[PDB]
Design a protein around this ligand. Structure first.
Ligand SMILES: NC(=O)C1=CN([C@@H]2O[C@H](COP(=O)(O)OP(=O)(O)OC[C@H]3O[C@@H](n4cnc5c(N)ncnc54)[C@H](OP(=O)(O)O)[C@@H]3O)[C@@H](O)[C@H]2O)C=CC1
Ligand SMILES: NC(=O)C1=CN([C@@H]2O[C@H](COP(=O)(O)OP(=O)(O)OC[C@H]3O[C@@H](n4cnc5c(N)ncnc54)[C@H](OP(=O)(O)O)[C@@H]3O)[C@@H](O)[C@H]2O)C=CC1
Ligand SMILES: [Mn+2]
Ligand SMILES: [Mn+2]
Lengths: 403, 403
């Protein structure tokens, strides 16, 4: 018998779940600071009115608030470092996020830079970012406390330590963070999530599936995440399409919000693999490409590569994924039973209209070697966690099959 | 549609899982203190040799160690308060537990008393213990850090904030604790667990099932614990009997150790209900009665009472339990489908030889009103979490049916 060995690490988590829980953003933030910077996108939270509510709740609680509504999708080092300057100039002592993964990651990055800086600064978020064997700057408890109110059922960033920041100079899009950047309080408000338009619901919904399906097949044992990851796939297949077709289907929104929370906890305990490692340089070199669409456009080839070079333990995991996708009935540990996850995958991608080759997104074949370099330089952890080896030419071939 | 509302709270968790992970008890304890008190039972850890190993690893790591091997099953206030005096007399700054729930709870209690005490003491663990509407003493970060190495696949105490301490004067056996008493590091060593004799494997195995089955049916929504609780029941039904019949079945031991870890995390997020609330005064008034056997001897009547006074949401949960116990195939939300959990329960109790009336344990009918008073005084939280009301006469009747 092969013995089981693993180490489970999950930072303290405090999740407020329900509709209208934005109410609490003020009371909770006060416990951590008296003056907050409110990190958000540029239009939607404002247009929908939740920006005004959050500011009200914060002020009403007694938290003086500086609004930083500059976060564009796929946040950049410049937008994080410039928000940190505002934290240092205004003396903010707590970072509050209201938005999607782009807002919550920019918030964590701002908390890192501002907490480790001198008076005027002297450090950039990129110092914390992996890059080859570059000795990163340690992320310590100096990191400012973070309050995260997610507006999308996609990234699970409200319950992960990670921030994914793009460097426009290098085009790298690495993730980084630890227990000191895990949000102190996480707010999931169904009234905010239900306003996701259909396309946004589909994109972010598939990010949930991408996290848990990679967490399950990551190398090694990780049994504390597996039940959460499995349950998330079951919720995706049962409720994601319901949420896209009817944004006001509250039960479907609640299930995706729980599934997205599962993915955050699961992704903290375990980790993503080749699919995420290759989707990052896509959004890094093509910033107008959504993270979820990049994941979808390369999933089929990647899952086929891991299955063809896999073993019975990995095949058993892909088989459970297929069952959770309603693509099969019995779990088995063969190459054939694992292949049914590819059929269930294609079905999920089709029902969501996410099955597009990279060509239809704007990616060009000339960019392959650069994106491959980007995957290994900035996502080495994901490549290592993948259940099967991949050389630099394996990844180049995968990219071209996805064109 | 009924909206979903819940708050998830889980303290930071650090779990080292494998065989021979007692190796790490020294390195990990050093990160938290230089002089530890080693809290253990009186004979088994010593007889099996793991006491000598732990002391070695601790010394070898540079942690001077004072051994307190006085913990008897169902720890008492006196044994916790006397261990705290040794912590204060010797100047220990970290509490290390090597044993079952009785050792790990006594360790948490020692950490509480010693951390909040003056020079000589002036406070007892009972000050922290619930007792009617008695204003308990707040448990704060003053609590000494705790390192927990479990020796049994039963209580999940290595990943819970709780300590269950008996007061011999009152006979109460309440549980108490919070984030400040959650072990900093948790070590699960298969080489220690596999030495559990058959009866101990059966008793502690059923405590795992008792936690998760009550966590699932606790009142309100708690979806972050449910997948872990379900997966634990599946592991119990598939592997617990294998572990009892062959203590050296390593895969069965690993599954019960994971299932026991599931139960700890689940019991932290959710909570136990009537079964635990009534099993405590049993061990409180009859200290030689094992916690797990007390749970088993009252389960059938309690589960029948909750099912008869339940609703469709509660019935659906008991139905999922029945499916996980191999007692049924389809999940449904009816009284009939829920009743199949009782059949699967009786099957589990029979295969483990735990189906004994309270009479065969030594309980006497004259003790009913006292045990009922004990349930409400010291386990009010569990009664409140139960999915259906229970009056004081409901609990008296339940006790007599279990005789
Ligand atoms: N663990 C982690 O840290 C993870 C991080 N990520 C990263 O996090 C980011 C996630 O991006 P994602 O969160 O998917 O979407 P983004 O947050 O990047 O942007 C979402 C877009 O949809 C709009 N929007 C957001 N919420 C709503 C709503 N409730 N109703 C209407 N419109 C809305 C926003 O408007 P506005 O412009 O006003 O915001 C924005 O234009 C990506 O960069 C991804 O790489 C991905 C997975 C995990
Ligand atoms: N979350 C919590 O805090 C929970 C707490 N509990 C409480 O925790 C306690 C749990 O008691 P439990 O842990 O079930 O058993 P105990 O730890 O109370 O005692 C176990 C008995 O078995 C022996 N033993 C323990 N491990 C081994 C082994 N590996 N090989 C051989 N013999 C062994 C011990 O010997 P020695 O005498 O040498 O130790 C002792 O006699 C109970 O008091 C229960 O009420 C229950 C559920 C949850
Ligand atoms: Mn993602
Ligand atoms: Mn118990």
């Amino acid at each position: 018998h092969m013995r089981m060995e693993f180490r489970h690490n999950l930072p303290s988590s405090d999740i407020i779940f329900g509709s209208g829980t934005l109410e609490k953003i003020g009371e909770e933030t006060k416990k951590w600071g008296d003056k907050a910077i409110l990190v958000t996108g540029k239009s939607n939270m404002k247009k929908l009115g939740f920006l005004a509510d959050a500011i009200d709740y914060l002020e009403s609680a007694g938290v003086e608030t500086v609004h930083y509504g500059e976060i564009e999708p796929n946040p950049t080092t410049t937008v994080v470092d410039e928000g940190a300057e505002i934290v240092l100039e205004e003396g903010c002592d707590v970072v509050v996020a209201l938005g999607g993964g782009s807002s919550m990651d920019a918030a964590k990055g701002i908390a890192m830079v501002a907490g480790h800086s001198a008076e005027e600064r002297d450090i950039s978020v990129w110092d914390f970012a992996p890059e080859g064997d570059k000795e990163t700057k340690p992320i310590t408890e100096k990191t400012l406390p973070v309050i995260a109110a997610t507006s999308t059922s996609g990234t699970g960033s409200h319950v992960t330590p990670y921030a994914v920041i793009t460097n426009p100079e290098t085009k790298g899009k690495p993730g980084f963070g630890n227990k000191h950047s895990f949000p102190k309080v996480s707010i999931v408000d169904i009234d905010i999530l239900k306003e996701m338009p259909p396309r946004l619901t589909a994109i972010t919904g598939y990010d949930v599936f991408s996290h848990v399906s990679e967490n399950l097949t990551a190398k090694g044992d990780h049994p504390t995440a597996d039940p959460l990851a499995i349950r998330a796939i079951e919720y995706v297949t049962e409720y994601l399409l319901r949420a896209v077709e009817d944004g006001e289907d509250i039960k479907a929104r609640e299930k995706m919000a729980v599934a997205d929370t599962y993915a955050g906890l699961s992704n903290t305990i375990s980790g993503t693999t080749l699919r995420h490692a290759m989707a990052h340089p896509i959004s890094g070199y093509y910033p107008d490409i959504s993270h979820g669409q990049a994941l979808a456009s390369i999933s089929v080839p990647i899952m086929e590569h891991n299955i063809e070079n896999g073993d019975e333990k990995t095949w058993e995991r892909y088989s459970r994924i297929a069952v959770a996708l309603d693509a099969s009935k019995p779990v088995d540990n063969t190459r054939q039973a694992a292949s049914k996850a590819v059929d269930g995958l294609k079905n999920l991608l089709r029902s969501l209209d996410l099955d597009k080759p990279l060509s239809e997104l704007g990616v060009e074949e000339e960019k392959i070697p650069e994106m491959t370099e980007g995957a290994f330089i900035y996502m080495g952890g994901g490549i290592e966690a993948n259940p099967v080896d991949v050389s630099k030419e394996d990844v180049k071939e995968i990219f071209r099959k996805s064109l």
